Structures are given as C-alpha cells and as structure tokens.
Design a protein around this nucleic acid. Structure first.
Ligand code: ZN
Ligand code: ZN
Ligand code: ZN
Ligand code: ZN
Lengths: 351, 66, 348, 460, 284
DNA sequence: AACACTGCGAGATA
DNA sequence: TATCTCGCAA
C-alpha cells in the first residue's frame, strides 16, 4: 500500500524564468456555500499563500493578478516582481465582494495583451482559477485560443466542482496538445496541493526552442546610513544596492535596474533554480523482510525501524524508506523532509 | 530627581468631594488635592477609607433590590 | 397589520367586541373574533351573545386561535361544547401554560406539530443582531440628597430629570444621524416626556393625541428623511411597530413592567427584518448611577439573556466631550434644570 | 507574591556574602535574576578587571533600556556587585566572593556543599514515595483550606500557618479558613504556594539556632538537584539536619523511612525553582485529570476532577450535588460574590483559569487561542484567546461591589518652563506613559520612564 | 526560551597537523577541544536546561558525538555526563584513524556535517511541538592549506543556507587557520544572520567563544560581531576562475561564465547557442 | 336638529 | 394576595 510517483521523466528541462499571470474569479458564482467561508474567501486566502510560495521558489519571475467581475477583466496588479504589491492587492480585494458573470474570454484577451512585453527567453503562463460553470464572451473564443497558441502561451486552469468542456479544450490546446493541466479539485486539501504543484516550473516534453543567453549583473550592498537616497522610488532609504553598470542605487530587490534596465540578482535565486533543475531519485521503501540493515535513522537518529515478528504489526511494513544512489536508510520523517524542503540528500552528499 | 509618591486618586468631582468629606471625618489623610479630578493621598488609610465608604453606602442606599 | 397584506379581505371577517358591533349571522365568509367577546365577563352588549348563537348555528369547520394561554381554558371548553365545531388550531407562544388542565387543549384540538424554536428563528437574519447596551451617565449631588428625602413614586421625578441625561441623549441623537440611522426612542412618564420632546425638536406621539397629528408624523417618518428621531409613549408601540430605525434609545423606564418593556422591545426587533449583511440594531438605555431605576433595568436585561440576546456595558463613548450642543452641560443650566424639577416636585 | 528575590535583597550585604560562599547558592540565585543581568554577570565573571559603566550602556540599544535599569537596580539592591566611583567613573565588579564561587562552580570548584550529594543505589521509584510526597502535600493543602476531615498533623506546620496567619481561620477555635492569606494560598498554584510556605517557615523559624547561611544552603541544595546518597546522613549541618527533617515533614523533603539515610530528593524541591510541569493508594493517572468548566455561557461543565481542586473551584461557586464526572455548580455574580465576601479580588482567578482548570480546558484554550497573535495585525479582531466577555462580567461584579479609582506613579514638579512640559507630554503621548498632565500646575503622577529618558538624553 | 546549540566541529588530522604545522606545534586541537567543552557547558547552563548536540567530520565520514546513538543496546553532574561522554566518544573516534583513514583525503565532509545537523534540528523541533525550540547551530573549522578554496562543496553549502533561513536557524561559524576568508562560509553566516570569526590559532578561544558565539539563541536586539564587509560579488567564472562582476550566465545550465564565451556549448552543459545571439552579445 | 359617563374585568404584583 | 394600568363600552 503505497502512493508514490513512479518516476520523473522530464528531469532535463523546465521553464526557470517565468511570467505567470494568475487570474482569480470574482463573480456571483463564487458566493455559493461549499467551502467554509465561501468559495471566494477561501480562494483568496489560498491565493495569498500561493503568491508567497511562488515568488519564493521562482524568485526571478514576475506576476500579475486579474479578476473577473461583471463580465469584465479589471487588472488589480501590474505584472511586477515585488510580492508585496500583489499581496496588498489581494488584501484589498478580499474585502470586496463578487458580482456579474465570469467573462473568461475577456480575461484571456487581457492577459494576452498583458504578456506581450515579456521577452523571448522569459516564459509566459496563465493560471485560471475558474470557479463558475459558464462564461459570457463578447467574441469568438476559439479565435482567442488560436491567437494564444500562436503566441506560445501555456495555460493551466483549476476548475471548481465540475468539468467544463471549453476549459478542457483550452488546456489541451495551448499546452502542445498534451492534456494534463486541467486538474480540478475535490477537496480543500486537494486545493492546497493544487496550488503547491502550480508553484513549480512546468515541463511536459519541450519542443526544441530558442535558448538564449541573458545579460544580467549583480549588485553590491551599500554602507552609509544617513546618506539615505533611492533611485527606484525617489525616497530616502538608509542604504541599498548598486547596479554594477548603471551604477545607481536601487531599493532591495531582485528587480530590474531602473536606470540601464538589466536584471539584478544575487545568486541565491540561481541556487533555487538549481534545486529545481536536477532533483533526486525518489527514495525507495525498503523491503519489509529483506532489508537487514542498520536499526536507526541515518540523517537523523530515529528509533522507528521495526518490531520483529508481531503477527500483523511486523507483517505490516518496515519503515526503512531508503534512497537509491547512497543506498542508506532514512526514517519516514527524514525522507519526507529531504524530498520537501532541502534537496541535498544527506548520505548521497557524503562519500 | 523629583518624584512625589503617594496614593493618586482620580474620579468625578462629586465623588472627589465625598472622599474629601470622608477623609476629613477620618482625620484628613489626603496628602494633596491636585485638582478637581485628582487627589494625592497616603495609601496607609485608603483601605479604611474604602471600608467606611462601604459602611455609609450600605447605611444610605441599603440596596432594596425590589 | 397583516390580514390585508395577507390575502384576507376584512369584508367578511367581522370584528366583534360587544362594542365594535359588526355583522354577525350574516357574514358570507370567515370571521375574526376574540376570546373576550367569544366567552368572557366582558359581555357588554348582546352582540357577543348573538355571535355565539350564530357560531352554534353554523358548524364552524375550523378555528384559529392566538395566545389562548392568557385566557383561562374554562371559556375555551365552554365554547367548545357550545359550538360543536369540526376542527380547531392552537397558535401557542409558551411551552408551559396555565391552560394545561386535566383536559388538555391539545387533545381538545390536536397534537403538536411544530415548536417555535427561537434558536432556529432568532439567528438566521430577522433581529439583525440585538446589541443591548446601557449608557452609564453620571448623577449629581444636589439631586441625590433630594432623591433620598422622597419616596412613594414622587421620587422618580428626581431620578428621570437629570442634566447628564440630556448630554447623553443629544450625543446619541447626533451620533445616529452621522451613520444615517433613524432613532425610535421610548419612555414611560407622560410629563417628563413632553419636556424632553419639545426642547429637542422631535414631534411626539403620546397619550390622548389626535390621530390627524399622529398619522402626519408617520408620513414624515416613513417618507421624509428630516424626521429620523421620533418620541413615542406607549400608544405608538402597541399599535404599529416600524421596521426601520436600526438604533433604539430607552430613556424613561418603569419598575415591574421590565418584562412588558421586553415584549415591546422584542416586537420592534422582530418587525425590523430584511436580512442585511451588517444590520446592527443598537439598543441604548440612559441609566443614571445610584438610582432605583437602573437596578430594575438589570432585570430587563436579564430577560434578554434568557432570549439569547447579548448584553454589553458602555460607560461613556469617547465623543460626548466634543459636542458643544449638549444642553444642561454648563452649571448654570444645571441649576436652571434644578429649579424646574423642584417646581415639578412641588406640582406633583 | 512577596517575591522572595525582594527578601533576598532585604538581607544585609555581609550575610549576603556569607551566602555567596556557597557556590550552589550562587548558581541558584543566578537562575533568578532577569535575563539582562544574567548576561551581564556572565560577561563580568571571567575578565578579572572592573569595567566602566559606559560600555554596559552602549551594549544595549534602543527600545530595551527599561530592562537595563531593571537589571542594574536589582543587582545593586542585592549588592551582588560593588559600584566604584574610582575616578569619578563607575568601576563595576561583583562581590568577589560571588565571582569566585560562581567561577569555581562553572569549572570544578571546591563547593563541597553543592557536591554534598552521594551516588548509590537510588532505589527510589518514580511513583515510589513520589505519590507519598504528593499525598502529604494534598493533605496539608486540604487541612489548611479545610476539608471534611483534616488529617494534617504538622504541629510545627500548623503553628507556622497560625502564627504566620497563613489563612483566615480561627486557630483558637482550630479554624483553618481562607483569609486574604488564605485567598492567596488558593491563588498561588504550586510555585506560589511552596514559596509562601517557605517564607512562612523562614519568618517563624528565625529566632534561635537559625544559621541562615546553613538554612539557605540546605534549601538550595534541596532545590539544586538529587543529592540522594549520604545527604541526610552526611551532608547537613546539625541545625541543617533539624531543618531538613522539618522540611521532610513539610513534604518538601522526600526522605525515606528508617530516620537515618541519604537525602530523599522529592520532586517538590525541583518544583521550587523549575517553573515547569506541575503534576506529581497506588493509582493516579492524569495529565489533564482536573476537569473544570468555563465557557462563554458562564457555566461549570466538568468531566475530569480532583477533589481538592474541585473544592477550590467551589470556593467561588455553589455546590448542590456531586455527580460522577460533574459536580452541581454554576458560576454567577453570586458565585464569585462568595469569594467577594472573603474580599477575594477577581485578579488571581483570572490567570488561575488561564492556567488552572486547563487540564479539562486544553481544547477550549486552543480554540480561543487560535494562534491569533501573528494573525492579529492582519485580522484586527482577536478570536477570544483570553475571553474578554468573562473578564468584563467579572469586572462588572467587582465594580458593583467597589466604586473607587486609584493610580500608580509619583507626583512630579520642577517643570520650570512650558516648553519642557509640553515636549515631555508629547514624548509621553508617543510612548503612552502619561496618565494625565497639565501645564498650569506643571505636575503629574505617572511612571518614571519619561523623566528617565529625558535625564539620560540631557546627561549623556 | 530554550535553544539547541548544535556545534559542528570538524577535525581533519591533516588539518590538525596543519595546525601543528601552522606557527609552532605549541599545542594540538586539545586547546580547541577543551575550550569547546567549556563553552558547551556554558550554554548548557545559561538557559532553562536546553539540549545540545555535536557532530564531527573526520577524514572518511562523520559521526555523532554527544547525543550518543544507542551503544549499550561533577557540577550539576549533567555537565559531567555530557562532557565525559563526549570525550569518550572523541577518543573512540581518534582510535578510528589509520592509513586507510589517510587515503580518502579527496573530499572534506563539512557539507555533509552541516546538512545532517540541520536534519537533526528539524527532528528535534518536529518532535517537540510544545515549547518550540529557538535552535541555532555552530561551525568550528581548523583552517588548513593545500586548497585555497575547495569548491566541489559549493552547492550543498548554499542548500544548507536556504534550509536554515526557512527553518529560521542562525548558523555561526568560527574558522581557525590561515588568513583566508572562507568565502562560502562567510556568505553563509552573513546570509543566514550569523557571525563570522577568523581567529588566530593558539589563543584560548573561550573568551572569543563566550563573547561572540553566545548571542544568537533568541535575542537579536544586539549588534552581531562580524568582520569586515561581506561582498556578494559571487563565484568566479566556471571556465575562467576569476571572480566575476558583470556576469554572463548561460541558460538552463545556469553556470556563470566569463566575458570569454567559447562560442558554443557552455562548458558545463552541452548547449550550443544561437550564433545570432552570440553576435548580439558581441555587438558591444 | 340631543342620552348619558364613567364601571369593569383582562394582566400583572410586591 | 393587594395594585395599578388600561382597554373597553357606549
Ligand atoms: Zn527605491
Ligand atoms: Zn543599472
Ligand atoms: Zn531520521
Ligand atoms: Zn542518497
């Protein structure tokens, strides 16, 4: 009795840069009573969580937020790389209440307009949190979908408790045909993990596309305190960074230089990327009676191994889920922790 | 360093006047009367001030609770 | 209040009183009657007797009853035997009633089918959240020693007439107009009511007021927005309850009838229904300290805890010190109010 | 709380050093000081040279200077140090006996006292005689509060309670009832109760054959750690041995039978200083046995129970019929008016409920808690973590019975100009320390924080 | 507020000899060991009985010291047990030394040490949900020569950093050796809100330790004691080896390359580039 | 192109 | 069980 992914078969490519434009759904449907406060409040709360998470794991991307009220798509946060703006925008929205019908077509068109400036190496995306069971379009939709797939704009949507044919067509269409991206939910926890899996970059099997070197430079922190002075918000700020080339102060960020317009990063962002590129082989669960290995943990020192012949208890299993390449044991907690938070396998590091 | 300690009392002026009456009845322990809304007292006798206040309020009102 | 809003046409439902002579033994359709007329010592005219004779003549297939617990079941059983009806109905109000005698009115009429589950009713949206509050206004040393020297009713005239009560009333009046909420004040005293209704410029409905002036204020309250603070005695609350005004202020309160004030205050909150998102129905009570009325007002709030309504205490709202329009705030006006109250105690 | 630390600083300096001769006592009192003082002392202990105060000021930054004063005032009051106006400056250094004793304790000193313990066959079982100590503590608690039958035979303990006036009971008639002292005894759960009793034994046992240095040596040696072997036999003064026997009678010593053996280290002495878990014929399993009742409906719902605990609850609520898991009781204004008759303030009971009766209110305090502190800045409305409704009702009953308002601080003057008074008032409003002020009188009665900050700004 | 100070002392007998080689052989690690014992006792006393832990890094692996994995199956005297157990374990470890131990000098398992220690911190925090442990680890390293900057451990160190920041665990480091600022460690302490201390060899650290390695438990109103600036002009070019400022980073490879593009197939991932893009870069 | 006007039972009451 | 209110009828 195990619930594990068999194997990862695109551990070669992902979209590391991103520009994901999450589009919420604020329309009369979202006011029904299936999720604890409503659909809407729970949705926005989880949206905040996802914003934090996504801007953590992909700390070089941008993001924009879009609502769908009264059949209109009203941008509530410009595509920007500072999480706090989007966070505040969502805060503001959550106190406002939905109306009108969701105009999927308008939101789609607004996005396609929005992502034009994003350069070729950056990758586009949208994430429709579609909640209702209808749309209300002021135009042909398949027209838009065709324009989309022409502009190389992958789309993933998370329907609420139903399946809508057009959305299924939409996901199947933009994502190079390979349909896996219209996942819809059946529980709140399912919803949390839905957003979580939306956080990561997105491979399926990438067509051979243009791969391009991108100019960027790293800043150096500043020293003085009273000389507070800023060139990205025109304030007094007690000390920040210096563009190596533009050579002007910039308040703390991985932002783009507001003088000479080149990307700024430290490295730790690149480190996050590295973590996403080449993950580990999924740790194997050791055979119950065939292990005969050390009775402890390895990374930690846990005493949860077996019980040695106990009718049904020992017949159950032997908590020895052990990674492959280092071939050392690890208790369940250690394996969960390694594969979730820190991806340097303890033993596999040491040799 | 100037700090004049004591039992500071603040209430409505009517209750302040009643407290001054009671205090004079019990030999004027009030150290100072800062204003119409504040009083400076020695904390030594404030407890029996409250006791006699309770006694007189029980005498007067008697709490019919009808 | 309802039967014309309801489908009922009162053309057939002749109302009999033994004083409100109406068409008996000729009503083509259903009738509406009362226990006092149907069977009681209040058979002032033989109209009630003729109504009962007609009731015997026609086998009334059904009977509608409202609050029979108050009327003893003896008259009910007498008319049950007299009329020999086909069916009846009991629209009860209390789980236990004085008419639970050996012959229960249930088996006289029928079994129970529904219970007025007030926890199911009083929480889904009608009352709009009762917020029971009591403004603890201060009192004065000149009225307290004159309060203790008076007893046997002529002592409530010093309690109600307080200078800080006008500072708490004109502050809550100006506070509710800034939020756009109408005010429906209540009271008990007759005189003390006209003195607080004439100075604030708030039309009044009181005892023995002509109905041509009574309905004109209701046309200036339900249509005109300039009258958001009305002053009603005991006639304008037991006759018509207004579903507006989400802010209620109680000033004059009588002892004993604290449950009758609870029946009056409950009928206003039940009339105010529209299921709003906020719908905050504020209730205030200007109770002066160390007076015999605030200790009886705690029995009134104790009945509201029995209904499930939440009660909070508000000593003073931080805003009454910034209102220059509060009458009797200056000590000169407090001494002028003292002389007006000392003349009122000399007249009563 | 008499705040035994205050009693510690009460004693004169020479006897303070007398105590400091005992390294274990030095360690135990190190445990008590505020963290700021703890850190500063640990700094000074090693560099064998006085240090100017200016450094110890510049060590601390803004928004935390209040603790600097707390620490320095405390340490000076108990005179662990010696301020030195050597060159007109401040050459701080500890009472050197304290320094040397502490340093010895940190790296194998000669504290034969603290090392008085003996290692041997500690045949003492966890429940073994631990249940007996718990039973003795319960018996004395019941006898002092007054149970249906008080088997409390502590003639010395009874004398201490009476002469100490432990509880408002007519000891002349044998009454052991709750007075203001009795109310406090009902209030101080474990550390408070043990502390009050220790202070009472101190005050009563203060006449002859005291040897206060040996007294505290024995007390702290008990609280330090399990001496076990040879404790009662060897490691005790003569009067120390007598005091140890008395404490063992008082429960605070879990000495074995045979009247001659090593020290019996009961958990209670640990409880004296630990400020930790409180749980102690041969049956007694309960991490949450105490099943009290306290919700928003002001009712008493009890499943878990403890007879003395539920009696404590009854000390402010009515009892009609004891049930299997419940006891007939409903908390009202009358219920607390019972304790108000004893004049018991609705203050200790607050934190008591917040802490005690929680063995049955764990989930209640968790759902009220809801971690609504990190969520407080975002969701501006608290989720009744500490129930304010109950607090308001209690305050209303207290107000109904009281009618008097008082303020702390001290009167202030020498506000020569209106500018200084106005600027200080503005700064106080910024820091929220001004209870009330008026420029016409140039006086007010508030906390000393504004004057402290202004004086520090002026002088340095 | 209890704290779990989990020292991580690395002991390379190669680096131990270097310490003997450095300056004079006027004292082996024994000084460091004793000072560490004392500091550990100090922390063990400071708080309300808050646990500790210690890990090592010998030439051919790592092994715990204090928590003392199941083996059988004075002064407060708990100090006694901790210290005597640690010293028994460390002498046992010193028995674990020979030529086959001298063989696998290729690596330096410090990164494994930090990673495992972090896992330990997570274990303890997770088990002790009640009374949340404001934990924080340490690092003691004997700075030796023969490698100006070993880099094959660069990534796992940074993964340690990120784990630390997420887990909210300051990590302080004390390097004892030549005047070579351990760049990765320097960034580790600076980023994870730590403190760096590049002592000289033979001084009895205990003062350094108890001063600047004791203010990180759960205080943070206090100025840390870090050395001169912590420039984040990061890794030198993979191809070149000279520290880069205006970087030139390929792609999905992510390697940082100098101003010298090989024109194709960045020399860490086989990815030929658009020669048009190459010219666009060359447009300067 | 003139009848009077007050008694009397409901609920509630300390 | 004594006491008001107060609608109520004409
Ligand atoms: Zn800026
Ligand atoms: Zn620039
Ligand atoms: Zn493990
Ligand atoms: Zn591995």
């Amino acid at each position: 009795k195990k619930r594990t992914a068999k194997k990862n078969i695109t551990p070669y490519q992902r979209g590391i840069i991103r520009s994901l434009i999450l589009t919420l759904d604020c329309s009369e449907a979202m006011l029904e009573k299936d999720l604890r406060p409503n659909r809407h409040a729970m949705i926005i709360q989880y949206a905040i969580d996802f914003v934090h998470e996504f801007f953590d794991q992909n700390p070089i991307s941008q993001m924009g937020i879009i609502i769908m009220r009264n059949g209109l798509a009203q941008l509530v946060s410009q595509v920007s790389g500072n999480p706090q703006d989007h966070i505040d925008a969502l805060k503001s929205i959550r106190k406002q209440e939905p109306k009108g019908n969701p105009s999927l077509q308008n939101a789609l068109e607004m996005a396609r307009g929005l992502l034009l400036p994003v350069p070729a190496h950056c990758t586009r995306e949208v994430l429709i949190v579609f909640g209702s069971l209808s749309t209300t379009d002021p135009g042909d939709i398949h027209q838009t979908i065709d324009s989309l797939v022409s502009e190389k704009i992958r789309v993933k949507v998370l329907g609420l408790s139903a399946q809508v044919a057009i959305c299924k067509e939409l996901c199947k269409a933009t994502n190079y045909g390979d349909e896996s991206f219209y996942k819809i939910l059946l529980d709140e926890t399912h919803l949390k993990e839905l957003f979580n899996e939306a956080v990561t970059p997105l491979p399926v099997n990438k067509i051979n596309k243009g791969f391009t070197l991108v100019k960027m430079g790293f800043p150096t922190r500043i020293f003085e305190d009273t000389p507070t002075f800023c060139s990205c918000h025109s304030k007094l700020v007690y000390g920040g960074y210096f563009c190596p080339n533009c050579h002007s102060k910039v308040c703390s960020l991985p932002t783009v230089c507001p003088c000479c317009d080149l990307m700024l990063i430290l490295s730790t962002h690149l480190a996050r990327s590295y973590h996403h590129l080449m993950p580990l082989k999924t740790f194997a669960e050791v055979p119950t009676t065939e292990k005969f290995r050390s009775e402890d943990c390895f990374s930690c020192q846990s005493r949860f191994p077996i019980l040695k012949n106990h009718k049904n208890g020992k017949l159950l299993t032997s908590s020895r889920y052990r990674c492959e390449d280092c071939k050392q044991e690890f208790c369940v907690d250690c394996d969960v922790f390694i594969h979730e938070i820190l991806h340097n396998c303890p033993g596999c590091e040491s040799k | 360093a100037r700090a004049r300690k004591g039992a500071l009392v603040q209430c409505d002026p009517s209750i302040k006047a009643l407290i001054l009456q009671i205090d004079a009845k019990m030999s004027d322990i009030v150290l100072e009367e800062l204003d119409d809304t504040h009083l400076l007292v020695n904390p030594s006798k404030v407890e029996f001030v409250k006791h006699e206040l309770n006694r007189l309020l029980s005498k007067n009102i008697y709490n019919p609770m009808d | 209040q309802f039967l014309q809003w309801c489908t009922l046409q009162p053309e057939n439902c002749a109302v009999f009183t033994s004083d409100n002579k109406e068409m008996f033994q000729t009503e083509s359709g259903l009738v509406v009657s009362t226990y006092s007329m149907v069977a009681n010592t209040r058979n002032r005219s033989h109209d009630s007797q003729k109504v009962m004779d007609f009731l015997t003549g026609r086998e009334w297939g059904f009977i509608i009853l409202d609050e029979v617990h108050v009327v003893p079941a003896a008259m009910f059983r007498r008319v049950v035997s007299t009329i020999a009806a086909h069916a009846k109905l009991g629209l009860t109000a209390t789980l236990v009633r004085e008419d639970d005698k050996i012959g229960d009115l249930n088996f006289l009429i029928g079994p129970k089918l529904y219970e007025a589950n007030w926890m199911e009713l009083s929480q889904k949206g009608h009352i709009a959240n009762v917020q029971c509050a009591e403004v603890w206004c201060p009192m004065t040393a000149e009225f307290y020693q004159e309060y203790l020297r008076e007893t046997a009713r002529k002592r409530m005239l010093l309690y109600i007439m307080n200078p800080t009560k006008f500072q708490a009333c004109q502050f809550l009046i100006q506070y509710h107009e800034r939020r756009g909420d109408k005010i429906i004040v209540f009271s008990d005293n007759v005189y003390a009511l006209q003195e607080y209704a004439l100075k604030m410029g708030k039309p009044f409905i009181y005892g023995s007021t002509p109905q041509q002036e009574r309905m004109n204020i209701l046309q200036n309250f339900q249509y005109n927005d300039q009258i958001n603070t009305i002053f009603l005695s005991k006639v304008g609350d037991t006759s018509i309850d207004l579903p507006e005004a989400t802010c209620l202020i109680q000033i004059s309160s009588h002892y004993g009838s604290r449950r009758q004030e609870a029946q009056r205050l409950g009928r206003i909150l039940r009339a105010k229904r529209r299921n709003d998102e906020g719908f905050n129905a504020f209730f205030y009570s200007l109770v002066s300290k160390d007076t015999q009325e605030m200790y009886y007002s705690t029995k009134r709030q104790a009945f509201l805890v029995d209904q499930g309504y939440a009660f909070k205490v508000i000593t003073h709202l931080h805003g009454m010190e910034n209102i220059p329009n509060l009458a009797y705030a200056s000590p000169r006006e407090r001494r002028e109010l003292l002389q007006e109250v000392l003349l009122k105690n000399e007249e009563a | 709380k008499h705040s035994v630390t205050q009693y510690l600083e009460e004693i004169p300096q020479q006897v303070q050093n007398r105590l400091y001769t005992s390294p274990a006592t030095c360690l135990a009192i190190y445990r008590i000081l505020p963290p700021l003082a703890k850190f500063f002392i640990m700094a000074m202990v090693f560099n064998e040279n006085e240090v100017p105060l200016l450094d110890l000021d510049k060590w601390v930054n803004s928004n935390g200077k209040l603790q600097f004063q707390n620490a320095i005032k405390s340490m000076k009051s108990l005179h662990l140090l010696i301020p030195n106006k050597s060159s007109g400056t401040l050459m701080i250094n500890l009472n050197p006996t304290f320094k040397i004793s502490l340093r010895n304790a940190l790296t194998g000193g000669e504290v034969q006292n603290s090392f008085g313990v003996v290692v041997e066959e500690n045949v003492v079982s966890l429940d073994l005689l631990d249940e007996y100590s718990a039973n003795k503590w319960e018996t004395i608690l019941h006898f002092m509060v007054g149970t249906p039958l008080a088997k409390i035979p502590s003639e010395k303990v009874l004398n201490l309670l009476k002469h100490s006036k432990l509880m408002e009971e007519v000891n002349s008639t044998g009454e052991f009832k709750i007075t203001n002292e009795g109310f406090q005894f009902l209030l101080q759960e474990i550390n408070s109760q043990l502390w009050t009793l220790l202070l009472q034994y101190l005050k009563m046992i203060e006449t002859s054959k005291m040897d206060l240095v040996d007294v505290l040596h024995f007390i702290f040696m008990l609280g330090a750690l399990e001496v076990g072997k040879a404790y009662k036999i060897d490691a005790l003064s003569e009067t120390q041995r007598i005091m140890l026997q008395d404490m063992r009678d008082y429960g605070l010593v879990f000495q074995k039978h045979s009247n001659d053996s090593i020290f019996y280290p009961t958990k209670l002495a640990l409880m004296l200083t630990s400020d930790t878990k409180t749980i102690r014929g041969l049956k007694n399993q309960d991490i949450p046995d105490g099943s009290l009742i306290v919700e928003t409906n002001f009712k008493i719902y009890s499943y878990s129970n403890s007879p003395l605990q539920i009696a404590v609850l009854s000390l402010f609520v009515h009892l009609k019929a004891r049930f299997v898991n419940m006891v007939l009781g409903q908390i009202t204004r009358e219920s607390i008016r019972r304790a108000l008759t004893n004049g018991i303030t609705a203050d200790q009971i607050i934190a008591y409920l917040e802490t005690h009766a929680h063995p049955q209110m764990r989930r209640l305090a968790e759902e009220k808690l809801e971690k609504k502190l990190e969520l407080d800045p975002n969701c501006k409305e608290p989720l009744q973590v500490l129930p304010p409704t109950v607090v308001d009702q209690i305050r209303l009953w207290q107000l109904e019975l009281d009618r008097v308002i008082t303020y702390e601080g001290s009167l202030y003057s020498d506000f020569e100009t209106s500018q200084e008074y106005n600027l200080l008032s503005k700064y106080a409003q910024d820091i929220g320390v001004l209870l009330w002020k008026d420029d016409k009188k140039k006086k007010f009665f508030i906390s000393k924080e504004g004057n402290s900050q202004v004086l520090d700004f002026a002088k340095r | 507020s209890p704290s779990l100070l989990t020292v991580i002392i690395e002991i390379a007998p190669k680096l131990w000899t270097t310490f003997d080689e450095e300056g004079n052989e006027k004292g082996s690690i024994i000084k460091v060991l004793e000072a560490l014992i004392v500091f550990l006792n100090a922390h063990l006393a400071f708080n309300s009985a808050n646990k500790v832990a210690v890990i090592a890094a010998y030439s051919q692996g790592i092994k715990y010291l204090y928590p003392e994995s199941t083996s059988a199956l004075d002064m407060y005297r708990r100090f006694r047990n901790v210290d005597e157990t640690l010293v028994e374990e460390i002498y046992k470890l010193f028995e674990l030394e020979k030529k086959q131990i001298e063989q696998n000098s290729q690596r330096s398992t410090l990164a494994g040490a930090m990673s495992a220690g972090l896992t330990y911190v997570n274990r303890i925090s997770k088990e002790s949900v009640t009374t949340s442990l404001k934990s924080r680890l340490l690092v003691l390293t004997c700075g030796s020569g023969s490698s100006k900057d070993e880099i094959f451990q660069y990534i796992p160190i940074m993964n340690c950093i990120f784990s630390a920041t997420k887990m909210k665990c300051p990590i302080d480091v004390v390097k004892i050796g030549g005047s070579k600022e351990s760049t990765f460690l320097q960034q580790t302490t600076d980023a994870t809100n730590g403190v760096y201390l590049h002592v000289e060899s033979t001084e009895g650290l205990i003062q350094y330790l108890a001063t600047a390695m004791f203010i990180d438990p759960s205080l943070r109103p206090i100025i840390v004691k870090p050395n001169h600036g912590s420039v984040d002009f990061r890794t030198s070019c993979y191809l070149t080896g000279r520290v880069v400022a205006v970087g030139f980073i390929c792609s999905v490879c992510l390697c940082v390359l100098s101003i010298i593009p090989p024109g194709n197939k960045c020399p860490a991932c086989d990815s030929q580039f658009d020669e048009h893009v190459i010219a666009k870069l060359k447009r300067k």
